[PDB]
Design a protein around this ligand. Structure first.
Ligand SMILES: CC1=C(/C=C/C(C)=C/C=C/C(C)=C/CO)C(C)(C)CCC1
Length: 174
């Protein structure tokens, strides 16, 4: 019944870049294909005078060579016709870190407690996503209250990602 076509997903209504600024702690994530951020992920979003949103992300990555590295990532966001969907160009402080361009959608957020992000890096022919990632972020590293957990679960279901997230540890590795 429920549609899994990317184009039908609801996003944050009238998203406010300025209220979203600040520190966000990744609590859980749905990983995409390939090398990705493993844990201890913390993001810091900022918005300049002109309305340009950017962010820096910190996190542990396990290199294919088994080297554990703390990646210092940077991302710049381009606005689209939907204030909640952005085009994010990203790169690392270190030249060997992954560089790319990914859609960045804010599915939902109350700005003060939690946020649900999503990106579809490859569309199936039917319109569903073939390779996606999603992060559940929190303002507080202690997490959310049960009431908030219930809203986050619903958003997960809405993206057709229910049961596919794993909790992320924070142990100050970076
Ligand atoms: C920039 C950035 C994002 C994505 C960073 C990525 C996609 C990092 C990938 C790390 C690579 C895979 C490490 C390779 O060793 C997130 C969405 C957290 C939000 C704001 C900052």
């Amino acid at each position: 019944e429920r549609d899994c076509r990317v184009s039908s997903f609801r996003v944050k209504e009238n998203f406010d870049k300025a209220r979203f600024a600040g520190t966000w702690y990744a609590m859980a994530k749905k990983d995409p294909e390939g090398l990705f951020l493993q844990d201890n992920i913390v993001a810091e979003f900022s918005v300049d005078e002109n309305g340009h949103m950017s962010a820096t992300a910190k996190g542990r990555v396990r290199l294919l060579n088994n080297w554990d590295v703390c990646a210092d990532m940077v991302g710049t966001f381009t606005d689209t016709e939907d204030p909640a969907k952005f085009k994010m160009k990203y790169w690392g402080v270190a030249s060997f870190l992954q560089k790319g361009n990914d859609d960045h959608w804010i599915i939902d957020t109350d700005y003060e407690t939690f946020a649900v992000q999503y990106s579809c890096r490859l569309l199936n022919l039917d319109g569903t996503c073939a390779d996606s990632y999603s992060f559940v972020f929190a303002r507080d590293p202690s997490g959310f209250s049960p009431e908030v957990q219930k809203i986050v679960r619903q958003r997960q279901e809405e993206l057709c990602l229910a049961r596919q997230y794993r909790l992320i540890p924070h142990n100050g590795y970076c």
